[PDB]
């Protein structure tokens, strides 16, 4: 029973709201397994500074599921929060984007983006930013009102292995 995509993401439940930036990222995954996966599903969270990732995109945590049976699969996914040392006080007080991405045998078919409002809940700090980032007073509010879902067409089960690894190019 291969109904196109064997795994489709029904959505994600942003449990953490309101949260802090240095507060653990907790997303609950809900997806429908059409046929029991012969391979494993890898779910991960990436933190993205706005778009091009001014903080250098960072995989906070990655989980692997199996054996994954038919039906809806649902579990809470917890990712360790990013350190503000990567994003200076004036740099993490911005809206950023979280990417939840699932890879099946190396092929990523689902990457979901969520925008996060990061600000100082204290007006005095919001208006006048301190030298040292006090992330414990920085509020992370995920705009779960707008899920950005991107689907990549991959080949499930009946795929012949050839180019499953991204061409490593000499960056910098």
């Amino acid at each position: 029973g291969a109904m196109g995509s064997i795994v489709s993401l029904l959505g994600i439940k942003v449990l953490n709201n309101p949260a802090k930036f240095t507060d653990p990222y907790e997303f609950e995954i809900t997806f429908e397994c059409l046929e029991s996966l012969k391979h494993d599903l890898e779910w991960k969270l990436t933190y993205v500074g706005s778009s091009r990732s001014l903080d250098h995109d960072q995989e906070l945590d990655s989980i692997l599921v199996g054996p994954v049976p038919v039906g809806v699969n649902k579990f809470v996914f917890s990712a360790d929060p990013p350190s503000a040392e990567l994003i200076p006080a004036s740099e993490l007080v911005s809206v950023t984007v979280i990417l939840l991405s699932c890879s099946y045998d190396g092929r990523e078919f689902v990457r979901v983006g969520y925008y996060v409002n990061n600000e100082y809940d204290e007006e005095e700090l919001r208006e006048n930013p301190p030298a040292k980032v006090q992330v414990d007073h920085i509020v992370r509010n995920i705009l779960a009102e707008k899920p950005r879902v991107t689907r990549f067409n991959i080949v499930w089960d009946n795929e012949n292995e050839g180019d499953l690894y991204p061409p490593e190019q000499p960056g910098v």
Partner: peptide
């Protein structure tokens, strides 16, 4: 109404 909580490992791939 059914669900599946699974046990999502932390990478820990084995072959």
């Amino acid at each position: 109404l059914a669900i599946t909580m699974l046990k999502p490992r932390k990478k820990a791939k084995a072959l």
